[PDB]
Amino acid sequence: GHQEVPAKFNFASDVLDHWADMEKAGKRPPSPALWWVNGKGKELMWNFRELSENSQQAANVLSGACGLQRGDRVAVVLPRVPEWWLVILGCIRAGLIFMPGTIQMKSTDILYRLQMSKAKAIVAGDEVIQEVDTVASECPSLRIKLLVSEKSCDGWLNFKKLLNEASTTHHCVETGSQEASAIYFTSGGLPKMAEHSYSSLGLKAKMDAGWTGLQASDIMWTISDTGWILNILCSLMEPWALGACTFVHLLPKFDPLVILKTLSSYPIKSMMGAPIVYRMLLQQDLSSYKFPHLQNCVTVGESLLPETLENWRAQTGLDIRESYGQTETGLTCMVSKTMKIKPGYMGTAASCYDVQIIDDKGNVLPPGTEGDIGIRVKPIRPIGIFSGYVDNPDKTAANIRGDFWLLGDRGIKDEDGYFQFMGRADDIINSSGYRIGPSEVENALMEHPAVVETAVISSPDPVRGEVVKAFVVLASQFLSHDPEQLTKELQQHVKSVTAPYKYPRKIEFVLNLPKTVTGKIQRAKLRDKEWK
Ligand SMILES: [Mg+2]
Incomplete structure (x- = not known):
């Protein structure tokens, strides 16, 4: 289809500079925008004026010192250091396409991304430059290597010193609403480049803003790899659309006790994390580290198990409000602060998305019927x-199916419009026409004492083309x-707890199962x- 958007949009000029301006005008006191801590005694905080100044300096470094021009793509591979926020804002201001990636990437991943994107610049931290430098020389478009580090490295521009030398005045580019702002690599086969616009990120964020329950004078902590689109949406745009503060912890180790201590030691009112964050925190005896200031707990990335919700309510007295999205669509469904929680459901449509469950021809299905989310x-492509x-x-x-962008997920919608996630459509097994x-x-296999973990996938079959196969991690017992008798026992056990055709x-039998960094079983890898 196409969009109904203003001609121009820029998150830095249209949102962040508003808050800066309000401070400058005495219309709002200086208010924290970014509060960073490393958990080892170093903390840093910018108010909105300082954030605007310092990100105008970033834009100047990028556009001036490094000569990056409107439309140039900038790989960004940083840990959770404030310079990620400054760099991204710097790109937004300068009209540069920022391309965030994880600081954990290996040189093969880096080479692929830099080459595929024809990135003109990479902004990187200490921890990845050795990997970058193994392959940077094979990326003919890569002209600028900007290092964020307390040290210098031959062949790398010193971002922090350049920042300091840069002017605090940058004229924000008058970016088009539909102009490319960012590229996020998926994994759909080989990684794809999902391009987002100034509006699909920033305007959408403006419209979603406060779904978390966050308010203007609050502090939100989004726990995220800086490479994940979650980081732009919830760490940066959500709080800043509202003029609230974003809290960032270096969190060099995913240490649940560091997380608890942090929640307990700072006035953090909202938090966002993947479900694993919550399950980990629940592996603590949370009771030595109360966090009475925390009000809003949201989550995205994986189905929030009803048990996890229940057990977080038990231990903390707080809800967890689930959200759902993908790189291509950002925040798609959510339980907003005013909505009742339905355990096992991820809420209702975002934000002027019309989300539906659709059949194989693209027709909207009635509630209670499984189809494709x-x-x-069409006719109108929504903002976001x-x-x-x-x-x-x-x-x-x-x-695209009919008038619908397929997320690739199965779902059911209930009577009140809440969506229940029913798995990746690509994980469905087609055996003997079932x-x-x-x-x-x-789940059936998991009931059996021998099974600690399991992943069920398709296997190509001589006789029936595709069959149901289970990878099982055994209990040591x-x-x-x-192995053969156990195999027949588990099958007998499944045949007997579910439709035998299943x-x-x-x-x-395997000793581990491949999982994402957020702990999701990678069935596609197994398949x-x-x-x-
Ligand atoms: Mg078991």
């Missing part, structure tokens, strides 16, 4: 949807058991290998 993008996969309109096309969800099978006709 989609966002209506990405602009397309860069250099790949076919892959963008392939994900569709089989892996979750029921995995069953390591001694006969049972795993193959079982492989890939499993098909030669």
Whole structure:
């Protein structure tokens, strides 16, 4: 379709500079925008005027000292240091396409991203420059290497010193609402470049703002890798749309006790994290570290188990409000602060998204019927949807069904419009003309004492083309058991707790299962290998 958006939009000029201006005018006291701590005694805080000044300095470093021009792509690979926030704002101000990536990336990942994006610059931290420098020389478009570090390195520009020398006045580029602001690499096959516009990030953020329950004089802590689109949406835009403060902890180790201590030691009122953050915190006896100031707990990235919600309510007296989204769509469904929580449901449509469950032809289905979760993008493409996969309109096309952008997830919608996540459509198993969800099978296997962990996928079958296969991590108590007899026992066990057509006709015992950094089982990785 197409959009109904203002011609121009820029988050820095249209949002952040408002708050800076308000301070300058005495219309609001100097208010914290960014509070950073390293957990080792170093803290730093910018009010909105200082944030504006310092990010105008960043824009000047980038546009002036490094000569990056409007439309230039800037890889950003930083830990959780304030310079990530300054650099991203710097790019927004200067009209540069920022391309965030994780500080954990290896040189192969870096080479692929730099080459695929034809990035003209990389802004990197100490911890990744050795990896970058192994491959930087094979990226002919890469002209600028900006290092954020307390030290200098030959061949790298010293960002922090350049920042200090830069002018605090930068004329914000009058960016178009639909002009490219960022590229986030997915994994859809090989990683795709999801391009977002100034409006699909910033304007959408402005419209979503406060769904978390955050208010103007509050502090939000989003716990995120700086490379994840979560970081732009919730660490940067949500609080700043509201003129609230974003709290950032270096959090060099994902240390649940550091997290608890932090929540307990700072006046943090809202937090966002992946469900694993909450499950980890629940592995603590939270009771030595009360956090009475915390009011709002939100989560995205994985299904929030009803048990986790229950057990967080138990221990903290707080809700966890779930949200749902992907790189291409940002915040798609959420439980906002005023909405009742339905355990196992991820809420209702964002923000002028029309989210529906749709059938294989693209028709809206009635409540209670499983289909494909989609966002209506015809006749009008809503604000918040990405602009397309860069250099790949076919892959963008392939994900549109009728009037709908397919998220790739199955779902059901209840009577009040709440969505229940029913798994990745690509994880459904097609055996002997039956569709089989892996979750029921995995859940079945999990009831058995021998099974500590399991992942159920398709396996190519001689006789039936595709079969149900289970990878199982054994309880140590069953390591001694006969693999063949145990295999028949588990199948007998599944045949007997679910429709027998669902049972795993193959079982492989493994010592671990591949998982994301947020602890999600990577079934596609297992399925890939499993098909030669
Ligand atoms: Mg068990």
